[PDB]
């Protein structure tokens, strides 16, 4: 109930959306008899719609007047599962992908023809480098201190000013 919202377990417009979406699926299932694969598919959709709406009820999500869940991302940890906990999961994975892509580039940069090892990937070297990305926040701090991360300004090309 942060910004004048309500919890979805206590808002009737969220309950009305659950009632209306199941009722639309049950009307389609009524036009088929019992054992048919259209009726067995629509029974699974009713159970998946029911499981989705009950999951959102019991899980701290704030609903508006429209009955839809709104996410709070001001930094509070009572709503950490909406943005910050998926946000730590993204930063760890995307930092991994970036770190091992940078690590593979500098590895093959000292070979004879570095461009052919970028269109034809050295797969055992790349697969070895890719598993090193799980400690990318440690090795990015180590490369930042040791100077291997940031190039000096005299080594980087620039245009006339």
């Amino acid at each position: 109930e942060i910004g004048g919202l309500t919890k979805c377990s206590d808002s009737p417009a969220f309950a009305k959306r659950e009632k209306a979406s199941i009722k639309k699926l049950e009307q389609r299932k009524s036009t088929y008899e019992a054992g048919t694969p259209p009726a067995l598919a629509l029974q699974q959709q009713i159970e998946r719609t029911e499981a989705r709406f009950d999951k959102y009820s019991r899980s701290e999500l704030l609903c508006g007047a429209d009955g839809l869940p709104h996410l709070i991302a001001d930094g509070r940890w009572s709503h950490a599962a909406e943005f910050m906990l998926p946000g730590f999961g993204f930063i760890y994975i995307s930092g991994w992908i970036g770190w091992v892509g940078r690590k593979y580039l500098r590895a093959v940069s000292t070979t004879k023809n570095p461009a052919e090892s970028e269109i034809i990937i050295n797969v055992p070297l790349a697969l070895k480098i890719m598993t090193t990305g799980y400690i990318w926040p440690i090795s990015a701090w180590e490369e930042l201190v040791s100077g291997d991360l940031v190039a000096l300004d005299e080594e980087v090309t620039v245009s006339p000013r």
Partner: peptide, 13 residues
């Protein structure tokens, strides 16, 4: 251990 007293002269950025 974090080398926080080396951050100023580590790079030039």
């Amino acid at each position: 251990p974090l080398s926080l007293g080396k951050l100023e002269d580590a790079n030039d950025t």
